[PDB]
Amino acid sequence: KVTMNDFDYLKLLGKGTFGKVILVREKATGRYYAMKILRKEVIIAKDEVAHTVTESRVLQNTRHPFLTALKYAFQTHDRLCFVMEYANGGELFFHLSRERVFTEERARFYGAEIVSALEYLHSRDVVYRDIKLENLMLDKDGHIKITDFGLCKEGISDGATMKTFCGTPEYLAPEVLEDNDYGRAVDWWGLGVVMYEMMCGRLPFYNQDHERLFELILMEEIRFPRTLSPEAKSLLAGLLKKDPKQRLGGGPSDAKEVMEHRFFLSINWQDVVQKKLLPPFKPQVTSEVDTRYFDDEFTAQSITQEMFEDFDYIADW
Amino acid sequence: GRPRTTSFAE
Ligand SMILES: Nc1ncnc2c1ncn2[C@@H]1O[C@H](COP(=O)(O)OP(=O)(O)NP(=O)(O)O)[C@@H](O)[C@H]1O
Ligand SMILES: [Mn+2]
Ligand SMILES: [Mn+2]
Structure with missing residues (x-):
């Protein structure tokens, strides 16, 4: 005891x-x-x-x-x-708020580690539902540590669905803002929002009033800085596709679609999970x-x- | 700037 x-x-x-x-x-x-x-x-x-x-x-x-x-x-x-x-x-929120924006290579490092963690959770039939900068921590070495499993749902294999209206307002997937059920693809939308924040320096959709915010998530089209690389624009457009069936990671192969995207071409997925890569920032x-x-x-x-x-x-x- | 965001559950 x-x-x-x-x-x-x-x-x-x-x-x-x-x-x-x-x-x-x-x-x-x-x-x-x-x-x-x-x-x-x-x-x-x-x-x-x-x-x-x-x-x-x-x-x-x-x-x-x-x-x-x-x-x-x-x-x-x-x-x-x-x-x-x-x-x-x-929190990744602390670092991003201070630095305003991360380089595409730095965002790729964190993104790869989040994808590895989400692939694992999905393989264990768990949907996370609350991907956000406040829930993504850095350990003493500079590696990602996902915390806050407060809105997780167990027993969600393959194309199984959930009905609870939950998450964080600014990070909610369009399908969650619609009636009835939703699948595991909500985690890929969440990844898209954090990747957008890391590479573009702001949330893709924002308004202080929740009613107006929800209308933006459902109806507004995402914009990209002119200077963002074509592979980053493609990743964000894919992860932030409103229809979960058309979303990157929204298909039957789940994480494989995200892992195989051209933005992650330089990533060796076994090196990621085995912590072989050098962190772009080590906490001082x-x-x-x-x-x-x-x-x-x-x-x-x-x-x-x-x-x-x-x-x-x-x-x- | 973006303020801190909190979760919810209906
Ligand atoms: N393992 C940890 N190590 C260090 N800080 C942590 C850890 N877990 C949580 N925190 C910090 O504590 C904050 C709140 O914890 P969290 O588990 O997210 O609470 P919560 O009430 O579920 N929040 P939310 O549901 O997001 O509104 C986080 O955003 C982190 O800044
Ligand atoms: Mn939290
Ligand atoms: Mn929570």
């Missing part, structure tokens, strides 16, 4: 409407982790138990170099805790408690069953 007192609570890494992520240190080992804390009362009241259990299950049953791994998963009388591996390098952290790659809005803040049966976990590593 793992308790709350087995850890030291240092500083806040991130905060959402439904949870907090704190940098913790295990007293017995001296090792640093990121603990996601969720309140049971908020989850039960909003009827989000199924999604929270799935988040734990996906974290328990996944093992990939570009996916954040789970060390422990425990619960108290009022809280649910996920003890994950700490991504020292912060001086210690394991150095949070220079996390926003000051969060780090400066002070930090003072039968239903959840498939929640608990202790890792083999």
Whole structure:
């Protein structure tokens, strides 16, 4: 049994409407982790138990170099805790906001690692549904670590469908903004939005009002900077195709279509998964408690069953 | 600039 007192609570890494992520240190080992804390009362009241259990299950049953791994998963009388591996390098959102735009080669590196992770998730019958810059982290070496498995759906093989209206507004696929069901191709749209942000310096569609934003995602055509390479324009047009059946990765071969696109011609896919490629940026952290790659809005803040049966976990590593 | 984006579930 793992308790709350087995850890030291240092500083806040991130905060959402439904949870907090704190940098913790295990007293017995001296090792640093990121603990996601969720309140049971908020989850039960909003009827989000199924999604929270799935988040734990996906974290328990996944093992990939570009996916954040789970060390422990425990619960108290009022809280649910996920003890994950700490991504020292912060969000891709932090780096892109600072640098405004990435080179096509830098975006290709991150893109290749995200494709590798999504191929793995899809092979395990899992659809991620929340690809966004805030959910894409960098580890101490500069490799991608996908975090936040809160909206994942299990048991989705081949052309199987999902019905839950969920995701992040600015990243929603056109088919999700339509009635009825949708397939796994929503993850490729998400990849398209992050690749667009990395290479063009902005979201493909934006408006502060959700109603106007949804109209843009469904009706507006994407624009490209004149200087963007033809292979990058082709990748973005393919990943951001409104019809999931016409989308790159939307066909029966899924990830293979994205992997074989001319934009990724220079990529050896086995070298990607085996971490053989040199990262275009290595986080300049001086210690394991150095949070220079996390926003000051969060780090400066002070930090003072039968239903959840498939929640608990202790890792083999 | 683009502000932080949050997820939702109906
Ligand atoms: N393993 C991790 N290491 C370091 N920071 C992390 C880790 N996991 C999450 N974070 C940070 O904490 C923030 C919030 O965690 P997240 O798991 O996305 O919460 P959430 O409530 O599900 N957010 P969302 O559903 O996107 O609105 C992230 O955007 C990261 O900045
Ligand atoms: Mn998130
Ligand atoms: Mn989430």
